[PDB]
Design a protein around this motif. Structure first.
Motif, mmCIF file in Angstrom:
data_model
loop_
_atom_site.group_PDB
_atom_site.id
_atom_site.type_symbol
_atom_site.label_atom_id
_atom_site.label_comp_id
_atom_site.label_asym_id
_atom_site.label_seq_id
_atom_site.Cartn_x
_atom_site.Cartn_y
_atom_site.Cartn_z
ATOM 1 N N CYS A 157 0.842 -1.183 0.000
ATOM 2 C CA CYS A 157 0.000 0.000 0.000
ATOM 3 C C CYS A 157 0.877 1.233 0.000
ATOM 4 C CB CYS A 157 -0.910 0.004 1.223
ATOM 5 S SG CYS A 157 -2.070 1.344 1.299
ATOM 6 N N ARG A 200 -0.139 4.338 1.294
ATOM 7 C CA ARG A 200 -0.397 5.267 2.379
ATOM 8 C C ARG A 200 -0.170 4.672 3.753
ATOM 9 N NH1 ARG A 200 -6.615 6.682 2.646
ATOM 10 N NH2 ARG A 200 -5.932 8.178 4.248
ATOM 11 N N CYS A 201 -0.121 3.343 3.886
ATOM 12 C CA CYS A 201 0.244 2.718 5.148
ATOM 13 C C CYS A 201 1.387 1.741 5.006
ATOM 14 C CB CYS A 201 -0.944 1.994 5.781
ATOM 15 S SG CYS A 201 -1.536 0.587 4.875
ATOM 16 N N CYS A 234 -6.825 -0.973 -1.110
ATOM 17 C CA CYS A 234 -6.134 -1.634 -0.016
ATOM 18 C C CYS A 234 -7.139 -2.142 0.993
ATOM 19 C CB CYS A 234 -5.150 -0.690 0.646
ATOM 20 S SG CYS A 234 -4.510 -1.268 2.204
ATOM 21 N N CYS A 261 -6.270 -0.054 5.367
ATOM 22 C CA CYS A 261 -6.960 1.224 5.265
ATOM 23 C C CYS A 261 -7.293 1.398 3.801
ATOM 24 C CB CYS A 261 -6.108 2.381 5.772
ATOM 25 S SG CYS A 261 -4.515 2.557 5.016
HETATM 26 ZN ZN LIG Z 1 -3.276 0.548 3.190
#
Ligand SMILES: [Zn+2]
Lengths: 71, 247, 50, 53, 84
Positions: free
Chosen positions: E18, E20-21, E33, E36
């Motif tokens: 992912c 963003r995380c 994803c 999140c």
């Molecule tokens: Zn994620």
RNA sequence: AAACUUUCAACAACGGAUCUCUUGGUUCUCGCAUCGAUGAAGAACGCAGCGAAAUGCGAUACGUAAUGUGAAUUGCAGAAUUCCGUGAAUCAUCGAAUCUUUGAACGCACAUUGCGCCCCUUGGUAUUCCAGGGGGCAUGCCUGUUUGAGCGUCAU
RNA sequence: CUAUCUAGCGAAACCACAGCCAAGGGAACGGGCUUGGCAGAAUCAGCGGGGAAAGAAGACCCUGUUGAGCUUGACUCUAGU
RNA sequence: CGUGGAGGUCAGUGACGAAGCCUAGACCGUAAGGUCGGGUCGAACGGCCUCUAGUGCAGAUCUUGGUGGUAGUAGCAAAUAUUCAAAUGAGAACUUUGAAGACUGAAGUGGGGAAAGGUUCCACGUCAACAGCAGUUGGACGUGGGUUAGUCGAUCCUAAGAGAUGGGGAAGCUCCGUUUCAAAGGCCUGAUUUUAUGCAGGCCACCAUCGAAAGGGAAUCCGGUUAAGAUUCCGGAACCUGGAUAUGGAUUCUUCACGGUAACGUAACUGAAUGUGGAGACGUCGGCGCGAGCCCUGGGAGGAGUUAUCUUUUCUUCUUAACAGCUUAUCACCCCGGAAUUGGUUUAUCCGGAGAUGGGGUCUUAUGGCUGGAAGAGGCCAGCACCUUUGCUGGCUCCGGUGCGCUUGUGACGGCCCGUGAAAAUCCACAGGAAGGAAUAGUUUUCAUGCCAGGUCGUACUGAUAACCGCAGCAGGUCUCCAAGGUGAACAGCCUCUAGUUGAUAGAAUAAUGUAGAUAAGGGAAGUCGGCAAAAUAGAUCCGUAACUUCGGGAUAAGGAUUGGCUCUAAGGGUCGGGUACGAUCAACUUAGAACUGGUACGGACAAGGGGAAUCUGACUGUCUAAUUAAAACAUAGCAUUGCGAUGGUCAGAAAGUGAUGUUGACGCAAU
RNA sequence: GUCGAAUUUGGGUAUAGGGGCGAAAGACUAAUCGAACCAUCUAGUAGCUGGUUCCUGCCGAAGUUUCCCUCAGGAUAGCAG
RNA sequence: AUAUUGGCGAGAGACCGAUAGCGAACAAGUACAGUGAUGGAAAGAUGAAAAGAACUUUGAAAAGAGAGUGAAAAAGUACGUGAAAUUGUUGAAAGGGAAGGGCAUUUGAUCAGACA
């Protein structure tokens, strides 16, 4: 990398990750006051970038390495 | 129980029609000032075979009336046409096999095909390989014509509705038995995913209302009602008659 | 793979630099409860899922 | 030569050998711990078929 | 066989990293994803996973800006030059 | 009779109980109100003379500027009056800055370190081409500006 | 090629305590109890009589005011039409 | 009675040793338990009166941790196999070299790659652990080194499909839809003396974007080089794209080239809007033609092997890249000419008055030939030197043949279908005739030459009986490319060459029972639920073949005979003085026949059908219960029934300006 | 057993839990399928099974009556402290 | 005036004392497992001070034996005390198909105090 300095006119540097073979050809012109035939570039497996810049047939690679100071 | 396999078809998702190899939507050209007053000439450039249809198509080309351009249309080619034949299209056109004429202009007793129900739906009535409609009378009052259909049913439509003249090519396609499951497989390989039809009585009670039992039978009367709901509608849907007619 | 993307070559180059034992001068400080490098991966035992 | 990097910054050539031999054993008791404790609930499967009758 | 001979046919990943995380949850076919929801605006969080918010809430990271706000409040969000 | 088996004690072994500790929890009370488009929470990758992690930080990268204290840091190396001083330090404070790639994430895209566009400038015969730099380019909405549209419509 | 013997390496199921029988009585088929027969260290390779051997809170049957899959004119409803 | 904590008291005990723990040492109490001595040990802890509770364990197939008996036991037994000497070393069945012996045997145990792994690659140290024996070795431990791109891939374009905007649903996270009921744009110069710009005169009305390291696609090859990298480096030789851009040539004073009857030709040889056309662009099978690489092979020029005898012998090197020039064809086409006595012609039957045969030409350049590249490289030898860096000098690198060979590229055709077997990006061409332009001038940058630039990320290695997944260094699983000789129909099996490996715990003995493989007197299914298991038959050639039948089959039906070795004879081709009866001639492996011969053996190993007579049942081929059920079940074609003419049938959605069938229309869709 | 085809297979993509998909076995849907996996409501409920931790002293039972969708259970009377 | 199991800063306890108390006293939402949502541990104490054993000798080496530090290595980084299961050496005794236990005494060992 000393074999590339002594046999060919290849200076080997570690360049920053955001440089793009015009910022290296122009850096060696501005830092060392030489001319560069051709720049090659790889990204080492320790995540850094290595640049095989190459001086051109009348500048010598041993004289530039000695003026820098790594023999 | 599960949802039964005639309920799984409305979601599509494997059951949609396989449309990679088809040429396009076979449709009559739009109704314009050329086609209401007088005719407009076009030439059959080629006769192609689209995948998943028993009738050949015809790619006629009509020059653009208002722009300097060519406009190609796809007709369902009917018997006797050929490449290089001129197709005339409109009210004041001739009466030969291939022209497209409004149904008022044709005499009673002629046969036409690819008729449109409403006068501008671009042709959607008798299209499969070998099916015509037979004009059985006009009506200059009310502006109506009545035709009979391939199903034997009589239907009265508008008189400005068009239709190309002649029985659709393809001819007697179903007179030849497929003889193999390997030939029926390739027929449905380019239609949609419905070919190997498991009988309902072979299934379990979850899978079908017919299914289950220590024998293979239906159990209840196989004629289902009309106001039955989605999932009961298996078997003859609203069978007035059933069985063989004479014997 | 061979023809790999850059954001997995950036990840396997970090794992190269973390594939190191404890520096031996760490064990000589005053309150040094560390005794070995316990987050140390090897390609035989533990695959990294990147 | 990065061997002198040790010799100026604490560690000696001898102190590395007796230090790593302790260190290579400090990971030995922990992996002997991991094999021993886990060996009870590691054969404890979930969906075994029982190929008999 | 459905066990050992069918675990050999597993060589195609279905989740990737992912953005963003930064963990292997970004499902490639769905293009979203799953720890999140990344193409979504707000991050995925549920009160039935009370433990799975301990691993991801405010405080498990650097807090590059938020860790100074409590100090800046005490002095009163002052500005200007300091002192002698 | 020995060996072997069993019991007990001594010393040794295995093993980590008990006892004594405790910068950790837990619950209770009291006081305050303080995240983000001025880019947050989270993420990724980096940064030390010798670091793998933790803690700290962002190409100014275990920090800088400022104020306070007044002589350290210390595992080692190194650095010495820097010691009656605009001044040590892994110090405290913190008001000035920096803040990579990201992320509500905002030029388009993103399984790509993928592709653009406008502007000021620099270089290569250079308005058009390639390149280095600097600054921009998301959407909804409000108020105002400017330019339009509409035989909607009113005088001319 | 094993098994067997040696050098090296070296587990598991299982285990109340354990291990010679006959009859008796007994929860009505004892390794132990009672009356007899008796009985000598340590053991090696086989073997499948026994240990109602091991495997898993019987998968059959019954009980539960315990469930689920399925069916229909069971009772109570419901999307749809 | 005992325990963890609380208030009170004993001005309690304690570094001269508190608590703990040990003790077939002592004492008290019916008992729960209390007290003392000794040993150990090192910082706190008790008595009594009361308070309070997370307060007393042998069990719960209890929970967590620890340890036993079993037990030095079961076992470490598939994948043919290892042995000798030496070196290193404290130490060798196991490491390294040499010498043997063998195996995989070109659908490899070989050389590469896509996934996936991620530093395993490589060197120097080193053996505590790991390598279920060992270890000096290692995919292990410790430290480092290593992956170079204008041409290779991504990036770019589209596929099935994902998906924002406008909108419309939804209490709402969000859902439908992908040109949609939208005011959704850029662009040529007239403008060019303001170039602000105005009328221009039209404009793709499609109108995000993502989607392929196997589809589409601008362009690179050879030789060297590293401990580890190469289509990336070095050396030579090229090509493409984006630019600028000056010469030479071309064309022009009729401004925008000539030649050929023609197909068309060339170094060039203005061409906007707009329109059209091609390339990209496509199935599979069969034989036939051609090409390339390999294979076989003759002569010569070298080097090594064999030699008691024999062998003009056995093995081996003798090679040419991208690119550029000139040329080279089936097909197609043009001209001349006018065909029944019908001719032409393919392995395969098609073609001709809609103009054959014939004569003469034109073109595409796949592909091949010559030459440049380029012998200077590479290969094989001989000689003479040496520091390590390193060489140095001579030769030689040649001329052919062959084919139902093998792989593979392709050409012209043929078969098949209720199956006609992707799309865009990009590129060019034509029609059009807007605009511009000559005398020192323009057009030329599609003609030759010259100048500059080509960014970003991946690049090592494995790809599996040890680098991936299976808890592991697991006999399992995992997509693909090249592919030698003999036997033989063959990529079968068996044996060898190149290349790789010789790893899998070993030593001694040869009991029982095993597992894998065998053989058998006489009988020959008497065994058993049952011919289960094993045996027999098998290749080829010639002979011979029934009932039944949907006339296709049955059929390799059944059943019978031959097969080696050696010496031979006859037949089947190509090129040549004689076909307008014949001759030397090079060159195929194919069939038939005959003698002679042997311990009557001959598909001599390998490979390789048992057959017949009937019943039940499903027509067939096909599919299914991954891991106890492969069947008579499911499917099928065939037959029949029902629904529906679109304001519709069957189905979907919470809903909708929503969807499947439907890019559809009764020869169709739907339900049986 | 089949071996040129209703063939085998890579990569891309589609359909997701009372749902998918099914040449139909209730098969398959990550060793899970007559209704996946994960977290939560949840310490679900149990008239049913197992366990239930110190000593001594004194007194010491019941399996019977009645009602119960009552019969492996309760209420009530009894016996007991 | 009211609510507050989150944030920030304080004070406290008849609370728990490392199988307890939060999952986490420690590089803990860490290592590790799963494609994924999610699941998720174990792990504290040398001494006041490292004074962490210089030197000698046997061994190829680890180590051993001395020596030395220390109040003590009966504290030596496997480190406070170091229980039991289970194990080794030494000492005692017993033993014909179990072992153990109860009452009673012989024999051996051992312990003993009013009068001692
Ligand atoms: Zn994620």
């Amino acid at each position: 990398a000393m074999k590339k300095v002594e046999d060919g006119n290849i200076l080997v540097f570690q360049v920053s990750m955001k440089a793009n073979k015009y910022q290296i050809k122009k850096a060696v012109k501005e830092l060392y006051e030489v001319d560069v035939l051709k720049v090659n570039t790889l990204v080492r497996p320790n995540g850094t970038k290595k640049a095989y810049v190459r001086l051109t047939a009348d500048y010598d690679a041993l004289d530039i390495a000695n003026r820098i100071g790594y023999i | 129980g599960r949802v039964i396999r005639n309920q799984r078809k409305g979601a599509g998702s494997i059951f949609t029609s396989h449309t990679r190899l088809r040429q396009g939507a076979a449709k009559l050209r739009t109704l314009d000032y050329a086609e209401r007053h007088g005719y407009i000439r076009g030439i059959v450039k080629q006769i192609v075979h689209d995948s998943g249809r028993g009738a050949p198509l015809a790619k006629v080309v009509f020059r653009d009336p208002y722009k300097y351009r060519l406009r190609e249309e796809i007709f369902i080619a009917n018997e006797g046409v050929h490449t290089g034949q001129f197709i005339y299209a409109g009210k004041k056109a001739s009466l030969n096999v291939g022209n497209v004429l409004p149904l008022g202009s044709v005499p009673e007793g002629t046969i036409v095909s690819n008729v449109e129900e409403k006068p501008g739906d671009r042709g959607a009535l008798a299209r499969a390989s070998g099916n015509y409609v037979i004009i059985i009378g006009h009506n200059p009052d009310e502006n109506k014509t009545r035709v009979r259909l391939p199903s034997g049913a009589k239907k009265v439509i508008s008189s400005d509705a068009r239709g190309v003249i002649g029985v659709i090519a393809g001819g007697g396609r179903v007179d030849k038995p497929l003889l193999k499951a390997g030939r029926a497989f390739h027929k449905y390989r380019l239609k949609r995913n419905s070919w190997p039809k498991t009988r309902g009585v072979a299934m379990n009670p979850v899978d079908h209302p017919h299914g289950g039992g220590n024998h293979q039978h239906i159990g209840k009367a196989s004629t289902i009602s009309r106001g039955a709901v989605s999932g009961q509608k298996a078997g003859l849907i609203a069978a007035r008659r059933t069985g063989l007619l004479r014997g | 793979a061979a023809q790999k993307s850059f954001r997995i070559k950036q990840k396997m180059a970090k794992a190269k630099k973390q594939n190191r034992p404890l520096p031996q001068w760490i064990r000589l400080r005053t309150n040094n409860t560390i005794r070995y490098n316990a987050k140390r991966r090897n390609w035989r035992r533990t695959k990294m899922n990147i | 030569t990065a061997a002198d990097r040790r010799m100026v910054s604490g560690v000696t050539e001898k102190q590395y050998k007796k230090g790593m031999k302790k260190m290579q054993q400090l990971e030995k008791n922990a992996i002997n711990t991991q094999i021993r404790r886990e060996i009870k609930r590691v054969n404890f499967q979930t969906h075994y078929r029982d190929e008999l009758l | 066989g459905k066990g050992t001979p069918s675990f050999g046919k597993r060589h195609n990943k279905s989740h990737t990293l992912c953005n963003r995380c930064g963990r292997r949850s970004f499902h490639v076919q769905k293009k979203t994803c799953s720890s999140c929801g990344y193409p979504a605006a707000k991050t995925r969080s549920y009160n039935w996973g009370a433990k799975a918010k301990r691993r991801h809430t405010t405080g498990t990271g650097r807090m590059r800006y938020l860790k100074h706000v409590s100090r800046r409040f005490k002095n009163g969000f002052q500005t200007g030059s300091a002192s002698k």
